[PDB]
Design a protein around this ligand. Structure first.
Ligand SMILES: [Au+]
Length: 323
């Protein structure tokens, strides 16, 4: 292991102040420009719109254009300019640090896996929610695909087992993963019709492709809202907050490009312009940065440290999503 934050210290501890409980939704394939709050023509986040204390960040650029590249970068100490995907798994990352400091780290995954981020931590702290052995919400559609909201079931059990400790829960979404956007949401979210249902996306009618994509965002709006509602059930005992950031965007036919994964050197803007949301309860004292702050995935690690009152010199200078 190559360390970067052996100096990290937690300035206040959960025996001397309210324990802190944070959900970090690690999003998938969502584009900033399809978010209502960023000026999109459709109301793709109706439920998040009803919740007080949500900040939408309108200028966030991902570290890369794929899950394998972006996800380790989101938790890295090195920042986009120095990040090396090929050695990321041997670097101390922000979850390693928080775990060393006693913060209970949980990682539930309805996407693939943590792309190496959790590899140094006990395997019991990672749970596969793509399978009904863990996920109780899979038989709600014709494909029997486990839904992101199932990652919230049994979270009370985890909180009860970590009573009084600081907790950081990562929920790795299936989200808007393509090509089969139409599979990504239950029928209650099929608001925009007709929808593309083919694997050759260039052969779908463009509007029908957009419709499937936007319906998948409605299901993610629901999942994020439900995550906040779950946190709210613990707000008297815990200082609760929710961070959402997508791993990358998506091309939807611009210049004949589909899906993602374009190398950064020529990646179109749509693959790197991602949404970010931050919610916190009024008791926590956490203050969001300005909604239009120029931000990147580099802001994630200092945000997670600040949420737990941790300082590490490697990122002391670094802009976060919060003050
Ligand atoms: Au991804």
């Amino acid at each position: 292991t190559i360390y970067h934050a052996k100096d990290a210290v937690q300035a206040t501890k959960p025996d001397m102040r309210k324990p802190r409980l944070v959900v970090f939704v690690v999003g998938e394939t969502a584009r900033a420009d399809h978010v209502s709050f960023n000026g999109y023509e459709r109301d793709t986040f109706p439920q998040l719109a009803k919740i007080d204390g949500v900040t939408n960040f309108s200028n966030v650029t991902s570290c890369g254009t794929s899950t394998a590249y972006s996800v380790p970068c989101m938790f890295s100490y090195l920042g986009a300019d120095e990040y090396d995907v090929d050695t990321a798994k041997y670097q101390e990352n922000v979850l390693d640090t928080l775990d060393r400091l006693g913060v209970s780290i949980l990682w539930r995954d309805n996407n693939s896996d943590s792309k190496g981020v959790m590899d140094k931590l006990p395997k019991a702290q990672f749970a596969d929610y793509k399978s009904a052995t863990n996920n109780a919400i899979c038989n709600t559609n014709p494909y029997n695909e486990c839904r992101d909201v199932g990652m919230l079931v049994g979270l009370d059990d985890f909180v009860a087992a970590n009573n009084g400790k600081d907790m950081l829960i990562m929920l790795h979404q299936m989200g808007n993963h393509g090509p089969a956007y139409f599979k990504r949401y239950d029928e209650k979210f099929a608001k925009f019709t007709p929808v593309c249902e083919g694997n050759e996306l260039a052969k779908c009618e463009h509007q029908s492709l957009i419709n499937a994509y936007d319906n998948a965002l409605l299901a993610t709006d629901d999942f994020i809202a439900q995550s906040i509602q779950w946190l709210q059930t613990h707000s008297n005992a815990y200082d609760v907050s929710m961070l959402y950031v997508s791993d990358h965007g998506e091309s939807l036919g611009e210049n004949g490009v589909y899906l993602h994964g374009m190398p950064n050197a020529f990646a179109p803007k749509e693959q790197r312009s991602v949404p970010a949301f931050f919610w916190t309860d009024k008791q926590t004292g956490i203050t969001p940065m300005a909604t239009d702050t120029v931000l990147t995935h580099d802001a994630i690690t200092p945000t997670l440290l600040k949420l737990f009152d941790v300082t590490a010199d490697k990122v002391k200078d670094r802009t976060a999503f919060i003050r």
